[model samples]
Target: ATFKVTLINEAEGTKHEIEVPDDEYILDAAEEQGYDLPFSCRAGACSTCAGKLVSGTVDQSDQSFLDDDQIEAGYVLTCVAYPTSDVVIQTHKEKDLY
Candidate 1:
């Protein structure tokens, strides 16, 4: 199922409302909507696109950079995260996280 994903870009101090399909990655989907979100190692080995999830869940089984503890704390790698429900995330949080 598709879900509404709200990304609060901390770096740019901006916010975007985008739609992400359950089968697609959040970064890719946001880019398709013309919203630029940070990214690197789109395969999920990097934390450039990491964001702190304020709410909702994501399927980040494709992610490798974040450990279970980090994921459990609501940090998600958007390059590999798939929306499981409507989400509110703060982008560029990796800097402060790790």
Candidate 2:
């Protein structure tokens, strides 16, 4: 399945939308669409690619970087997030969180 994913890069002052396939990482799909998103590790092990889920859900079972608390708080690791439905993610706004 494919889902429409929108990433709002507040730091970059931009927003990008792209089609993200199920099981495909959001970062990878966004990049392929020529949208720039801040990221360091592509293994869902850091906060550089972190984003807040403003709308819809994503299957991030591959990620272990975000603690259960954060995950429950809508924090998503774009590097491992696979859109389970259309999603709107606010990016580059939660990188400082440890």
Candidate 3:
């Protein structure tokens, strides 16, 4: 399935909107489209690729860094997150996760 993904970088006042496939991770898809998103462990062990969801949903069952409360609070590890619906997210949310 295809979903609309919106990424915002508040510190830089930058925003990106792209179409993403459900089969691909948000970070990988964003990078493929030329977005320089932050990431360290693509395996989802670290929170370096953290993002805060402003709307919509993602399949984050494979990600291990975030707890249930964090997930419920709209935090996700984009490196392992796949869009389940159109998503609006903000990058550089590592500190929030940490």
Which stretch of 10 consecutive residues in model 3 shows the poorest summed lDDT? 89-98
Superposed model 3: Cα runs more than 4 Å off: none
Best by TM-score: 3
TM-score of each: 0.92, 0.89, 0.96
TM-score of 1: 0.92
True-structure lDDT of candidate 1 = 0.88
Return the clash pairs for model 1, or none. Answer: none
lDDT of 1 by residue, 1-98 (tens): 78999989766888889988889999999889998778767889988888999999999887888888898899999998899999999988878665
lDDT tens readout by residue for model 2, 14-81: 78789988878898898888887788878878788889999999989988788999988999988888
Candidate whose lDDT is highest: 3
lDDT for model 3, on a 0 to 1 scale?
Answer: 0.92
Error of 3 at 82 (Å): 0.4
Q: TM-score of the candidate numbered 3? A: 0.96
So what's the TM-score on candidate 2? 0.89
Alpha-carbon runs more than 4 Å astray in model 2: 11-13
List pairs with backbone clashes in candidate 3.
Answer: none
